[PDB]
Amino acid sequence: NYQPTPEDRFTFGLWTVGWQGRDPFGDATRRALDPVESVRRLAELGAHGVTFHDDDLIPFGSSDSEREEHVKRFRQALDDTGMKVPMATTNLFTHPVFKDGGFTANDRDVRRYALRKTIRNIDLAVELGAETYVAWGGREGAESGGAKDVRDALDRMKEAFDLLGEYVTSQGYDIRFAIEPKPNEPRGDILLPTVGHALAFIERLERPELYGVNPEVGHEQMAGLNFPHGIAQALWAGKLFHIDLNGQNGIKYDQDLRFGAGDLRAAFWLVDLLESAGYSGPRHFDFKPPRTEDFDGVWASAAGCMRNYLILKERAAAFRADPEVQEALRASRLDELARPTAADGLQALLDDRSAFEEFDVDAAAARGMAFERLDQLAMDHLLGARG
Template sequence: MTKFKFSVGPWNVHSGVDSYGPATRNEIDFEEKIRKFAELGFSAIQFHDDDAVPNINDYTEEEIKEKARELKRMLDKYGLAAEFVAPRLWMDGRTADGGFMSTSQEDREYAMWRAYRSIDIAKELGCNMVVLWLAREGTLCAESKSPVWATKMLIHAINKMLEYDSDIRICIEPKPNEPIDRSICGTMGHVLAVSAATIDPKRVGGNLESAHAILAGLDPAHEIGFAMAMGKLMTVHLNDQNGIKYDQDKAFGVENLRSAFNQVKVLKENGYGENGEYVGLDVKAMRTTRDEDSYKHLENSLNIFKALEEKADRFDYEFQKKCVKNRDFEAIKGAHLFHFGYPTLMRRMYQNQGEELARMFRRIKEGGTAISLDMAAIDPSSEAAREDWKGILEKVLPYVDFFVPSAEELCFMLDRERYQEWSKRAEGRDITEVIRVRDVKPLGQTVLDMGAGGVLIKCGAPGIYYRTASGKRIEDLCRKLNLSMESWKDKEGFEPSFEPDAVVSGTGAGDAA
């Protein structure tokens, strides 16, 4: 069970339109998105001002408040809160040269009108935070405005917002560039400096987005830690990014898994969420995603975060302390066993016949490290289900010393026809209730034939089936782990589950059934 609460914005589910091409999916009704977000387990919704009140420029201040109250009733209907409201200043012609930093006083006044309306909407929705993503606050032509003047204009705008409402908190989301060429407030360090210069610094903080930190050449986990150390991290936008390119908003953890782990770890270690903060996602589906998978990137991000949260719970701090004391930092990286889980949830790991997963395992193996591989169930309607998993396993398993799938997962990947027969036989029950050891044995043999050192097939409540390779395969594993495993050559068996006298925690129950 995760200790965190999660938030998401309606823009995270979109039609696939981008700067270079038209829509690739159908638009989804706003309320249907809200309903689905609640179903997926989100606790709060992030809003732009014109998400909350479409065509906001057409309404009076009182009309805007009334429409916000209507939205609040919708949120209440689905048991959701509002996390923040953000003025979408970058989409109006009057903010082509920026909003708060525009060289036109009239346009600056319009930007403030939108900022005030965002505060009004936030109050009606029951939240006290306004996020400022300063999309066009900077320069396209470096000589077009003074950076000193522009910075002072930003501070002036924030001060006016703080004066407008005594409870509102202003959360700046930094980004070094795009769509602007040179941002005035591009990193969390800039955010803290601006905060300190306002009339009420305690009400001004930051929103760290993973991809934005990467675009600035920085480490997202360190940026999170820096902001937390200063008491300035108001929220996060977790996602992923392939290098210093354009803003990609990929699903969390699909590109930089170690960085994703450290982001989760620093949040968990330092009590993030204990004061009501949400773990916000800002991820978008790829244009190639089909209509039926419109929410899959959100599900994957949640699953990866929760899996890494469990990994953080098991982090070996004693081993870390020993390595730090001896200044043996290579030992922290040079573990004897590399355990990898859930490639079925990571598109990059199964694309191209699992080439990336095989490449990663090959490099790890060359370093002399043993490898264990855990799996996750594949949604039959998902993109992952359309992959050739038998071919992927043939490519990957020669590098795997311990393979730990469930019977259902493994059968789905190796023998789809048999999986369908099992499902039909189960008639809605758990598949493990209708299969026997004799059904699982052929799957174990196939795994060894593909090159794995050993397989443990989880069979739910009945227990676990195990089988190991023989001869040189186990001898190589003994050397890697510096263990004597001679007695484990060519072993096969089934260990039944034990029933505990009392249940203290359900953590890990999926694998301990």
């Protein structure tokens, strides 16, 4: 019955199950959770670990002795349970100082503060065991055209990331960075709005090897993009350092539903891809139990994240192992897609009359791709009508 175990690498942010339910239009519907309780409860559900923003773990503005107590208690709960902390991040979005951004705030003093706040938490993240440090630039962007010169902003963004890379290098840390794209919300448009834009930006950093992406299901879907396709591009680039799993119904505000909700078939094809590509990173849920729920419903929603991943993993595996699917894939020429177009080389291609001058385009055109039969096998497997 689809029971999670630590090898599944399922992780959760403190801010996920800890979301109190405040929204644009609404006061909290749930009391705050102690991070130690979340670690305990998630461990009992079969999670592998947890993640945190600085300000989730240590309230903003804490004294040194309050900070020490929060960290000691958390480290303790982790040491007790065997829960890991594979990723951490900085809150560069809540405090009003970040109203125009952290790294790309127009005010230079805010950009410097953002970097110092991030570096403090990188040290803590490393201490607690994180392999990935995420950046979600949710305040980087604009509501209006004159407010933000994007080339200058990208210069500032690059400067910031490059300084963070210099910092980790100077310390000999092994931690790597991952940019979590989002196209909009809370800014009217956010910089680096998709996986593609983040991948492209990373190529211009001084040490690109230190940076990858942390794509989120719902975020790419807020641009109407195909999340599995974007993950394939990230994999192709060697940059899928981490991933955020959740659900989203289409182009609208960022819902952060439990994984499996929203676009179920996209969830199926995503799990298929991660498993068959051998992604080995965390399966992290950046989700929020709806504010309709009480704590029982929080834990049910968290369990459902994991359950749905495991159901989908079984269905995708059954699909790929079915001889009838393997024959359909061949019928649709997926194998031919894996062959070089011209391993014979350019000159041979140019001189090959069979490729062009003498190619029977009509016979090629007439060959059906057989994609609908393939996709109905996939549907039948997902729905358990096969497998």
